[PDB]
Symmetry: none
Subunit: 43 residues, 4 copies
C-alpha cells in the first residue's frame, strides 16, 4: 500500500493548508492508485 500511502499523505496534508492544485493532483492519484491496486495483484 506504499503507493497508496504516499497519495493519502498529500491529500490530507493539502487539506489542512487550503489548496486547490495539490488537492487535485492527490485525489486523482488516489483513484489512479486504486485502479492500480485493482490490477496490481494480477500484474
Amino acid at each position: 500500500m506504499t503507493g497508496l500511502a504516499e497519495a493519502i499523505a498529500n491529500t490530507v496534508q493539502a487539506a489542512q493548508q487550503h489548496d486547490s492544485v495539490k488537492l487535485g493532483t492527490s485525489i486523482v492519484d488516489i483513484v489512479a492508485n486504486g485502479v492500480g491496486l485493482l490490477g496490481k495483484l494480477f500484474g
Copy 2:
C-alpha cells in the same frame, strides 16, 4: 457528453468559492464518470 458536463460545472463552480469539501466529492465524479462513459456504448 451530457453527464460529464455536470461534473465539470460543479467542480469549477465550487473551486471558485475555495471550498474543499464539495470539491472533493466532485473531482472524483469527473474521473468516475469519464471511465464510466468509456465503459458505456458497449453494454
Copy 3:
C-alpha cells in the same frame, strides 16, 4: 496596544476565508493604527 490587536485579528480572520473587501479595509485600519501609535500622546 489594544488598537492594533483588533485590526490584526480582523485581517487574519478575513484572510482565513477568501473575501477581499474585508482584507483590504482591515489592512487600511492596520496602517491607520500603526501611524496613530505615534499620533496619540507620544509627540502630542
Copy 4:
C-alpha cells in the same frame, strides 16, 4: 513603508494557510516594524 510590506505579506499568507509558527514570527514583525517606522523618522 516597504519594510512593513513583507511582514504584512507573510502574515496574510500564513493566515491563508494554517502554519501557526510562521504566523507567530510574522506578527511580531508587524509590531516590531510598527515602532521601527516611528523610530525611523527621527534617525
